[model samples]
Target: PATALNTVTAYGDGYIEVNQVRFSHAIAFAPEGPVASWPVQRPADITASLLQQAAGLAAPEVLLVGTGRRQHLLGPEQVRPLLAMGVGVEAMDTQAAARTYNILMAEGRRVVVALLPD
Candidate 1:
């Protein structure tokens, strides 16, 4: 179970603090909140296999991909599976992703975020 305010409140160097817990490594979360780990450390580390794992379980309405310290783009192949499953993908810096996640969560949208530390 997750808290009522199950959202990312802050993010900083090498960490994303969600619901007051600090994760120094990469992470993945759903609308319910943080789940298991995502084996991604940098933008280049994103692959179909990694995206497949992140899109595990129920699919979210959208997935926010935080590419560490800066925004990065994913090739067609890297995101084809998620798109094929009808999940929208958005890429941005970690800080922007955190903020966007909170906003979408508050709006009652089902969203998941894959964030890498800076």
Candidate 2:
């Protein structure tokens, strides 16, 4: 299970990266700053769609999202469907998300991932 789960490169603390350009991380909660490289320029609905699709999986206790190099705040209201599924989500810059994801995975927890481009 460990090897299979290691499809993404493991980063320190709570971060991971795949193909250099993409990243992910975890957070104690939603951040307070705007996320850079997110699909924010588009309709908010689009961002919602992206979350639904990107994090679409079984109800995970925690979800680690990568918002590129920039810090962006993404919360449950923005991702209602995932919340309805009984999932806890936290958003951070892509690098942070990657690190967080690795930490969760190392602890034998399942997590959904989403990465924003810069």
Candidate 3:
């Protein structure tokens, strides 16, 4: 599979558009093809298993969690596993994450964004 193109055409209200395609459900997107469905409606649902599976093999980078409409907290334990994998994790409000995704992506950073609809 080809690396999924990192592009955020738009993101707000009910959905986020990747490569200009709309995604209303929770989405885990990376620089790898075949975006994964993140079964996270809220920040509490996040787990290392979910994060890693969504990240796939083209990783070793950042995980931008667009935590819906607000910035939610992630316990250290919830992200400790990824830290061991040399992955940086940050939780942001949906719009902030979306905006940053574009900048980092354009700058050639390998970042995976897990976004939730607001």
Candidate 4:
């Protein structure tokens, strides 16, 4: 079973507001709320090993990577291992990712959002 899901309320100036609380550091979230094991700082710092770490703990059907400030695209090779684990990956800026997360979450999809500050 999944934990309680929180809706993203706002994002700006390197902070993500969820359930009215603002987070300034990189954060990972599943249906159950913030994931403590996945401590991501920047998009560039993420590697295949990190993705595997998150999946091993809690695999979401869709994974959203929120790069800071601007959109950062990940090469297929970079995400191949995760895809092989049956997880879909989407990369976008933090703001867009937050908005998209809320919509999908509202529909009850098993989504995970990894967000970095601007």
Candidate 5:
């Protein structure tokens, strides 16, 4: 099972290492692998519409929003719509989010991690 899940091996500078590969854009992952390379450079670009697109496919039970260098708490207005779709949201710095994602995925929970490169 561990081998089957997408892994966040390392993160720093301006790239996130997923399964030993480096990517320079914001990224979100499901067990299958990256679900999307977010269009925005910063977490400020996160919107209800963007999240809806992420859920339109997997609808992960929880989503970890990695807000680059530091945590950026998402407001209710930016997250309200997802609640109706039955998805939980957590916002934290990218480093923390990556750690959380690895453990959750290893435990086999339905989770997604979206991270910004800072």
Candidate 6:
């Protein structure tokens, strides 16, 4: 169940909040990127900042941002900075990215992810 999955991680809180059936998500930071599980209220720049700070790397090569129910709100400008920093960005619904990233990982592809809530 969605409730059974605690996929969101907040900056201030130490534990992941279980929203249970609600549109919540969590992110897993990697050496060069993140693995996101929804799209919430956070903006792209904010997401980039958080990932950059958390990864401790100069930049992230791959970013998977969750944009609510579908991939519509994400804009080119939102990813311009990351692209300038040489990060390849892809925006999609959290669920799709989660499944896609898992496949990538299974194929030995290196990537990062982020999840946003709806």
Is 1 or 5 the stronger prediction by lDDT?
Answer: 1
Task: Compute each candidate's TM-score over C-alphas.
Answer: 0.90, 0.62, 0.88, 0.85, 0.90, 0.55
Model 3 accuracy (lDDT, Cα): 0.80
lDDT of 1 by residue, 30-61 (tens): 76644568888779979967876776745688
RMSD of 2: 8.3
lDDT of 6: 0.49
**Candidate 5: stretches off by over 4 Å:** 1-3, 33-35
* lDDT on C-alpha atoms for all candidate structures: 0.83, 0.53, 0.80, 0.78, 0.82, 0.49
Better of 1 and 4 by TM-score: 1
Local accuracy of candidate 3 as per-residue lDDT tens digits, 17-86:
8887888889887765566788888777888787777665474578888888899898887788888888
Q: What are the candidates' C-alpha RMSDs?
A: 1.9, 8.3, 2.2, 2.3, 1.9, 8.4
Candidates sorted by TM-score, best first: 1, 5, 3, 4, 2, 6
Best by lDDT: 1
lDDT of 2 by residue, 38-77 (tens): 3433223335566665555444677666565666677555
What digit string (tens of lDDT, one per residue) describes model 5 on residues 27-113? Answer: 777877555777667788889787766555576888888889899889898889999888998989988988998988888899888
Off by over 4 Å in 6: 1-28, 31-60
Q: Candidate 5 versus the native: TM-score? A: 0.90
Q: Candidate 3 at 27: error in angstroms?
A: 0.3
In model 4, the runs with Cα more than 4 Å from the true position are 1-3, 35-38, 55-59
